[PDB]
Amino acid sequence: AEAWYNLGNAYYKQGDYDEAIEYYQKALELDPRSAEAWYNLGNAYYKQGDYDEAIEYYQKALELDPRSAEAWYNLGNAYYKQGDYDEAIEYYQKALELDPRSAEAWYNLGNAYYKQGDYDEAIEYYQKALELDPRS
Amino acid sequence: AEAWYNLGNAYYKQGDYDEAIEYYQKALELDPRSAEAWYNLGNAYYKQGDYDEAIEYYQKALELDPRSAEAWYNLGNAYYKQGDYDEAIEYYQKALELDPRSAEAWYNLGNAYYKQGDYDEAIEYYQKALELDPRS
What's the per-residue H, E or C state across A69-82?
HHHHHHHHHHHHCC
Q: Hey, are the CB atoms on A120 and B3 less than 8 Å from each other?
A: no
Question: Residue B104: CB partners within 8 Å, gap ≥ 6?
Answer: B73, B129
A 10 A CB-CB count for B30 gives 14
Q: In angstroms, rounded to a whole number, what is the distance separating the alpha carbons of residues B26 and B91?
A: 29
* Phi, psi torsion values for A84, nearest 5 degrees: -85, 75
Q: In angstroms, rounded to a whole number, what is the distance separating the alpha carbons of residues A58 and A76?
A: 10
Measured between CA atoms, the residue of chain B closest to residue A107 is: B3
User: How long a stretch of residues is chain A?
Assistant: 136
Q: Hey, are the CB atoms on B3 and A122 less than 8 Å from each other?
A: no
The method of structure determination was X-ray
Q: Contact, B110 vs B126, CB < 8 A? A: yes
- DSSP classification of residue A57: H
Distances (CA, A) of B101 to A17, B29, B54, B58, B132: 41, 36, 26, 22, 7
Q: Contact, B16 vs B24, CB < 8 A? A: no
Q: Hey, are the CB atoms on A135 and B14 less than 8 Å from each other?
A: no
- Which chain A residues have a beta carbon less than 8 Å from that of B30? 135-136
Measured over the CA atoms of residue B124, residue B126, residue B129 and residue B130, the dihedral's sign is negative
Q: Hey, are the CB atoms on A129 and B3 less than 8 Å from each other?
A: yes
Q: How far is A13 from chain B (nearest CA, A)?
A: 26
- DSSP classification of residue B8: H
What is the enclosing helix (H) or strand (E) of B63? helix B51-64
CATH superfamily of B1-136: Tetratricopeptide repeat domain (1.25.40.10)
Q: Hey, are the CB atoms on A126 and B13 less than 8 Å from each other?
A: no
Packing angle, helices A69-80 and A35-48, rounded to 10? 20
- Which chain A residues have a beta carbon less than 8 Å from that of B14? 119-120, 123
- Which chain B residues have a beta carbon less than 8 Å from that of A106? none
Q: In angstroms, rounded to a whole number, what is the distance separating the alpha carbons of residues B24 and B19?
A: 9
Q: Which residues of A touch B (CB under 8 A)?
A: 107, 110-111, 114, 119-120, 122-123, 126-127, 129-130, 133, 135-136
Q: In angstroms, rounded to a whole number, what is the distance separating the alpha carbons of residues A42 and B30?
A: 34
Question: Residue B105: CB partners within 8 Å, gap ≥ 6?
Answer: B69, B73, B92, B95, B96, B99
Q: Contact, B23 vs B11, CB < 8 A? A: yes
How big is the A-B interface in CB pairs under 8 Å?
40
